[PDB]
Design a protein around this ligand. Structure first.
Ligand code: POV
Ligand code: POV
Ligand code: POV
Ligand code: POV
Ligand code: POV
Ligand code: POV
Ligand code: POV
Ligand code: POV
Ligand code: POV
Ligand code: POV
Ligand code: POV
Ligand code: POV
Lengths: 35, 226, 226, 226, 226, 35, 35, 35
C-alpha cells in the first residue's frame, strides 16, 4: 500500500502514492506533495 | 483550561536563549567546512528548533484569550507568518531552498526585537514616525521620476550602463544622491561628450540635497519639540 | 455666465488622473522598441492630452474672476507657461524637439504638485525658506570665486582637466565640497607636483565645510524654534 | 607624614610639561635617520621619563588618603595600568616591542586629558552619553548581523573578497554604511552577475541610513533639551 | 579740517562698485589669450585701482578720529595690511609675483565682506563661535596626533605613500575622516598585508566620527538655545 | 489656392503658401510657419 | 646724475644709482630697491 | 656567583643565573627574567 504525507519514504524505492501526486524525497527523509 | 500564569521571566528568557542559539547556529552554518561535515547534526538541530518554536507560538496563541482576536499585535502576526512559511517546507510542494528559504531562517532572528521590551518599544516609534514624513517621500519620488526620465531620454545613447533604461538609471540617480563618485564615475565621463550635461548633475545634486536636508530638519521639529 | 460651482472633488480627481496618465505615457515612450511600433498612437495620445490640458487651463481662467487678475498665484503662471510653450510647437516655427521640447512634456508632470493640496502647501514653505538663507549663499559664492580664481592661476598648468579655466575649475571646487575623491582624484595627483598644494585643498575642505555646516545649523534655529 | 599641600599649579604644570615633552620625543623617534644616530640618548631619555612618571603616580597615591581607596577615579586606574605595563618591560619576561609595546608609550599621551581640567570634564560627558544610546547600538548590531549572514550565504561565491566569510563581509557592510564606493566597487561589479542584488544593497543603504540618522536625532533630544 | 559727513550711501556704493570691478578684472586676467594681448591695459588698470584704494583707506583713516585709535576694528586692520603689502611691490625689493603676490590681489576681494553690513554682521558671529568649540578642537588634535604616530610606526614600511612620515600620514588621517575611499584606497590595500590592521582604521573611523558628530551637536545647543 | 496655417498639407506636394513664409511638414500632418 | 627711487628708468640704459643698491626694471617702468 | 634580577649583565659573557631561569640582555644592559 502507498503511504500518504509525512511518511518515512525511501531514497531508492519510492512508495509515495502517485494518486495524490506525491514525490518521496531524502532531504526530510519522508514523503511530501508535488507541484 | 490554560488559565494559569505560564509566561513569566523564566519562560521569556528560555525563549530568548533559543532565539540567540538559533542565531548562532545559522551563523555557523555559513561556513562550508563546518557544514559539509556535520550536515546531519545541523539539519536535525534546525528541525528541533522549528518544532520548539511552533509549539512556542501555539502556547502563546492558546494560553491568551483564544476566542479573542490575539491578532491585533502586528508582532504576533510576524511570528505567525515566519513559523507558517518555515513549516510549509514540510507539508507543501517544492520549497527546498533556491536562495530564498534560507533567508527565512535568518530573518527568524528578528524575533529578538519582539522579546526584548526596550527594543520593541523603540522600533514602535521608529516606525510610527514614517507617516510623519509622508509628503517629503512623495516629493523625492516625483523628483526621482522626472530626473530619471530626462536622464534616460538624454544620455541613453552616451552612457548605456548608467542611463540605459527607465530603471537602470533610477539606480544611477540613487547612487548620485549618496554622492558616490557621481563626479568621477557618473558625470566626468559623460560631461566629456555632451558638454552641457554639467547642468543635469549639478542641478540634481543641489535640489536632491536641498530636499533631503530639509526632510532631516523636518523630523527634528517633529521630535525634539516633543 | 460661468458662475456655477464647476470645480469640485470629482473634477480635481479627473485632472489628477490625466496628469498621472500623461506621466505614465511619457515614461513608456522612453523605450525604443515600445516606441517605434506604436509611434502614431503615442503621438495622437499626446495631442489629445495637450488639448484636454489647454481647455483645462482655459476653464480655470474663465470660470474664476476673469476680469480679475487670476495671475497672483505663481502656480497658475506655471501651468500657463507650460501649456503655452507646448502649444507653440503647433503654431510657431521650427520647434520639433532637438533635445529641448521633450523636457517640456516631462516637466509637465510637476503639476502633480499644484493639484495635491499638501504638496503645494509643503513646497510653499520649502521655497519661502530660501531668502532666509540669503547671506550664507553670498558667502559661499564669494568663497567659491576666490578659491576658483586662485586654483586656476596656480594649477592651470599642472592639472588642465580640473583647473583649466575659471569655470572648468568652478566645477572641481563643487565636486570637492561634496567630498568626492577630492583626495584621491583631485589632490593626490596634484600634490605630487606642487608639494605645497596640500594647503589649498585642506584649507578649502575646512572652510567650505565650516561654512556649509553652519548654514545647516542656521536653518534649524529658524525652523525648530517656530 | 605626607600631609602637606604638595600638589598645586606649579606641580601640575611640571606634570603637563613632562607629558608634552614625552609626546614630542615619541613623535621624533618615528624618524629613522633621527633615530639610528641618537639611539642611546633616546633610550635613556625614555628611561628617565618612565621613572619620573612612576614616582609621579607614587606621590599621587601616597600623598592622598592611602588607606582610602583612591581607586574610585577611573583616571588614576588608567595612569596606574599604563605605568605598570610600561615598567613590566623591566622586571618581566620578553616584552621588547613586537609592534605592541611602543603603542603603549604612545598611548601614554592620553594623560594630557587627565591633567587639563576642561578636557577631563568634557570626556566625562562624551562618555557618559554612550549608555544613553544603548538600544540603537543593539539594533544596528542585529541589522549588521542579519545583513552579513545573508550577504555571505548569497554572494559568497560571486565576490569572495567582500562577502567571503561571516566577518570578511562584516567589514564590507561597514564600508557600505559610510558610503565608500558601495555602488562603484562593491555593488556595481556584483549587480552584473546576480541581477536581483540591487535589492540587498539598496535596502541596506536605506535602512542603515534610516537607523543611523535617527540615532543622530535621538542624541539631540537627549542633549539640546537639557 | 575733515569734519564734514563725507561717507554716505553714495560713497559706499562707489567703493562697492570699485571692489566688484577689481574682482571682475582679476577674474578676466586669468585667461592667457585675453591677457597676452591687453597686458599693458590690465597693468595700468591695476595701478589705478591700487591708488584709488590707497587713497580710499587714507580718507577712511584721516576723516575719522585720527588721533584716536581707529585700529580697534579688525577690519580696518585687514584693509590696511592688504594695501600695505600691495604697495610694497612698488617701494621695496624683489616682489614681482612668484606665485604669491597675485594671491594678494585676489584676496583683495574679501573687502566685499567689509562693506556689506549684513555680511560683516554674519562673519562676526561665524568667527566668534570658534572659541566656543575650543576643547573639542584640542581633543581632535590629540586624537589625530596619537593615530598619526601609531600609523606611522606601524605601516611606515607597508604603505610609504600614505604613512611615510609623521605628516605624510597626518594627511591620510585627514582624508580618512572625510571618508574618501578610506576603505578602497587607503585600507583595502594595507589590510592585504598586515591582516590585523582592520582595527586601526575601523577604530579611527568610529572614534573620529563619534567625536566630530558630537562637536556638531555641541554647536547646536550653543546656538539653537539662544 | 494656397492654404494658410493649420491646414492638412501633403508630404509630397507642398501647398504651403510661400507668401507667408510657410513650410508644410509631416510631423503634425499640416502646415505651420517657418523661420 | 643717478636718480633715486620712483624714477622713470630705462630698460636698456640703467640709471639706477648703485650707491643706494638700486636696480632699474621694466615691470613698473621705473627704479626700485634691490635686496 | 650568579647575580639575580636588575644586575648589569654582559652581552658577551652571560652571568644571568640559570637556576631562576634568567637570560641576560643588552637592550636594558642588565639581567631580566625569561619565559
Ligand atoms: C502622487 C503622484 C506620484 C508621482 C510618482 C510618479 C510615478 C509615475 C509612474 C510611472 C510608471 C512608469 C511606467 C514604466 C513603464 C514600464 C513598462 C515597460 O515597458 O517595461 C519594459 C520592461 O522593463 C520592465 O521590466 C519594467 C520595470 C518597471 C518600471 C519601474 C519604474 C517605476 C517608476 C516609478 C519611480 C518611483 C520613484 C523612484 C524612486 C522610488 C517592457 O518593455 P520592453 O523592455 O521593450 O519589452 C517588451 C514588453 N514586454 C516586456 C512586456 C514584453
Ligand atoms: C516649483 C517646483 C520645483 C521644481 C523642481 C523640480 C526640478 C526642477 C527642474 C528639473 C529639470 C532640470 C533639467 C536639467 C537640464 C538638463 C539639460 C541638459 O544637460 O541636456 C542637454 C541640454 O541642452 C542645452 O542645449 C542646454 C539647455 C538647458 C536645458 C534646460 C532645460 C529647461 C529647464 C527649465 C526647468 C523649469 C524649472 C521649473 C521647476 C520649478 C545637454 O545635452 P544636448 O542638449 O544634447 O547637448 C548637445 C549634445 N550633443 C553633443 C550630442 C549635440
Ligand atoms: C556681493 C558681491 C558678490 C561677489 C561674487 C563675486 C563674483 C564676481 C564676478 C566675476 C565675473 C567673472 C568674469 C568672467 C570673465 C569671462 C569672460 C571670458 O573671457 O570668457 C571667455 C570664454 O569663456 C566663457 O564662456 C565665460 C563663461 C562665463 C564665466 C562664468 C564664471 C562666473 C563667475 C561667478 C562665480 C559665482 C560663484 C560660483 C558658484 C555659483 C572668453 O574669452 P576666450 O575664451 O579667451 O575667447 C575669446 C573671447 N570671446 C569668447 C568672447 C571671443
Ligand atoms: C575674514 C574673512 C575670512 C576669510 C576666509 C576666506 C578664505 C581664506 C583664505 C583663502 C585663500 C587661501 C589660499 C590657499 C593657499 C594656497 C597656497 C598654494 O598651495 O600655492 C602655492 C603655495 O606657495 C608657497 O610657497 C607656500 C606659501 C603659502 C601661501 C599662503 C597664501 C597666503 C594666505 C593668507 C590668506 C589670508 C587669510 C585671510 C582671510 C580672513 C603652491 O604652489 P607653488 O607656490 O607654485 O609651489 C612650487 C610649485 N613648483 C614646484 C612648480 C615650483
Ligand atoms: C540581544 C541579542 C543581540 C543580537 C546580536 C546577534 C549576534 C549573534 C552572535 C552570533 C555569533 C556568530 C558565530 C560565528 C561562528 C564562528 C565560528 C567559526 O567557525 O570560526 C571559524 C574561523 O573564523 C573565525 O576566526 C571566527 C571569528 C569570530 C566571528 C566574528 C563574527 C561575530 C558576529 C557578531 C556580529 C556583531 C555585529 C557586527 C557589528 C559589530 C572556524 O571555522 P573554520 O574557519 O572552518 O576552521 C575550522 C575551525 N577552527 C578554526 C576552530 C579550527
Ligand atoms: C520589523 C523590524 C524591521 C525589519 C528590518 C530588518 C531588515 C529588513 C529585511 C532585511 C532582509 C532584506 C533581504 C534583502 C533581499 C536580498 C535578495 C537578493 O538580492 O538575493 C537574491 C534575490 O532572489 C530573488 O529572486 C528576488 C527575491 C527577493 C528576495 C526578498 C527576500 C524576502 C524579503 C522579506 C523580508 C521581510 C522584512 C521584514 C522586516 C520587518 C538575488 O540572487 P539570486 O536569487 O541568486 O538571483 C539569481 C542568481 N543567479 C544568477 C546565480 C541565478
Ligand atoms: C594640550 C596638548 C595638545 C596635544 C597636541 C599634541 C602635539 C604634540 C606635538 C608634537 C610635535 C611633533 C614633533 C615633530 C618632529 C619634527 C622634527 C623633524 O624631524 O622634522 C624632520 C623633517 O620633517 C619636517 O619638516 C617636520 C615638519 C613638522 C612636523 C609637523 C607635525 C606636527 C604634529 C602636530 C599635530 C597636530 C594635530 C594634527 C591635526 C592638526 C627633520 O628630520 P629629517 O627629515 O630626518 O632631516 C634631518 C633633520 N633636519 C631636517 C632638521 C635637517
Ligand atoms: C579615555 C580617553 C579615550 C581614548 C580614545 C583615544 C584613542 C583610543 C585608542 C587608540 C589607539 C588604537 C590603536 C589601534 C590598534 C592598531 C593595532 C594594529 O592594527 O597594529 C597591529 C596590531 O597587532 C596585533 O597583533 C593585534 C593587537 C591589537 C593591538 C591593540 C592595541 C592596544 C589598544 C588599547 C588602547 C587603549 C584604549 C584606551 C583609550 C581610553 C597590526 O600589525 P602587526 O601587529 O604588525 O601584524 C602583523 C604584521 N606582519 C604581518 C608584518 C607580521
Ligand atoms: C544650477 C546653478 C548653476 C550655478 C551657475 C554659477 C555660475 C555658472 C558658471 C558657468 C555658467 C556657464 C559656463 C560657461 C560654459 C557653458 C557651456 C560649456 O561649454 O561649459 C563648459 C564649462 O562649463 C562648466 O564647467 C560649468 C561650471 C559649473 C558651475 C558649478 C557651480 C556650482 C555652484 C555652487 C553652489 C553652492 C553655492 C550656492 C549657489 C547656487 C564646459 O564645456 P567646454 O569648456 O566648452 O569643454 C569642451 C567640451 N569638453 C568638455 C568635452 C572638452
Ligand atoms: C590649514 C591648517 C593646517 C593645520 C596644520 C597642522 C599641522 C601642520 C603639519 C605640517 C605643516 C607643514 C608640514 C611640513 C611639510 C611642508 C612642506 C612639505 O613638503 O609638505 C610635505 C608634507 O606636508 C604635508 O603632508 C601636510 C600635512 C597635512 C596636515 C593636515 C592636518 C589636518 C588637520 C585636521 C583638522 C581637524 C582638526 C582641527 C584642526 C584645524 C609634502 O612634501 P614632501 O614631504 O617634501 O614630498 C616631496 C614632494 N612629493 C610629495 C611630490 C614627493
Ligand atoms: C527597496 C525599495 C525599492 C524601491 C522601488 C522603486 C521602484 C522600483 C523600480 C524597479 C523595480 C523592479 C525593476 C525591474 C527589474 C527587476 C529585475 C531586473 O532585472 O533589474 C534590472 C533593473 O533593476 C534595477 O535597476 C533596480 C532599480 C533600482 C531602484 C532604486 C530606487 C531607489 C528609490 C529612492 C529612495 C529614496 C526615496 C524614498 C523611496 C523609498 C537589472 O537587471 P537587467 O535590466 O535585466 O540587466 C541584465 C543583467 N545585467 C544587469 C547583468 C546586465
Ligand atoms: C573596534 C570595534 C570592533 C567591533 C567588533 C565586532 C565583531 C568583531 C568581528 C571580528 C573580530 C575578530 C575577527 C576575526 C579575525 C581577526 C584576525 C583576522 O584574520 O581578521 C580577518 C577578518 O577580520 C575582519 O575582517 C574584521 C571584521 C571587521 C568588523 C567590523 C564591524 C564594524 C562594527 C559596526 C559598528 C557600528 C555599530 C556599533 C558597534 C560598535 C582578516 O584576516 P584573514 O581572514 O585571516 O585573511 C588572511 C589575510 N588576508 C586578508 C591578507 C587575506
Amino acid at each position: 500500500e502507498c503511504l500518504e504525507i509525512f511518511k518515512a519514504c525511501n531514497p531508492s524505492n519510492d512508495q509515495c502514492c502517485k494518486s495524490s501526486k506525491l514525490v518521496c524525497s531524502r532531504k526530510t527523509r519522508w514523503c511530501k506533495y508535488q507541484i | 483550561k490554560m488559565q494559569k500564569i505560564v509566561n513569566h521571566r523564566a519562560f521569556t528568557f528560555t525563549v530568548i536563549a533559543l532565539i540567540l542559539f538559533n542565531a548562532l547556529i545559522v551563523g555557523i552554518e555559513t561556513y562550508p567546512r563546518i557544514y559539509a561535515d556535520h550536515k546531519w547534526l545541523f539539519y536535525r538541530i534546525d528541525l528541533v528548533l522549528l518544532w520548539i518554536f511552533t509549539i512556542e507560538i501555539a502556547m502563546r496563541f492558546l494560553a491568551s484569550n483564544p476566542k479573542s482576536a490575539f491578532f491585533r499585535s502586528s508582532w504576533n502576526w510576524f511570528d505567525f507568518l515566519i513559523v507558517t512559511l518555515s513549516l510549509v517546507e514540510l507539508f507543501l510542494a517544492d520549497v527546498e531552498g533556491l536562495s530564498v528559504l534560507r533567508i527565512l531562517r535568518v530573518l527568524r532572528v528578528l524575533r529578538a526585537i519582539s522579546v526584548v521590551p526596550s527594543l520593541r518599544r523603540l522600533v514602535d516609534a521608529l516606525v510610527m514616525t514614517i507617516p510623519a514624513l509622508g509628503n517629503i517621500l512623495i516629493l523625492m519620488s516625483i523628483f526621482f521620476y522626472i530626473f530619471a526620465v530626462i536622464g534616460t531620454m538624454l544620455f541613453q545613447h552616451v552612457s548605456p550602463e548608467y542611463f540605459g533604461n527607465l530603471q537602470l538609471s533610477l539606480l544611477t540617480l540613487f547612487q548620485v544622491v549618496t554622492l558616490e563618485s557621481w563626479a568621477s564615475g557618473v558625470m566626468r565621463p559623460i560631461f566629456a561628450e555632451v558638454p552641457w550635461s554639467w547642468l543635469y548633475f549639478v542641478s540634481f545634486v543641489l535640489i536632491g540635497t536641498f530636499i533631503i536636508f530639509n526632510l532631516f530638519i523636518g523630523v527634528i521639529v517633529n521630535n525634539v519639540e516633543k
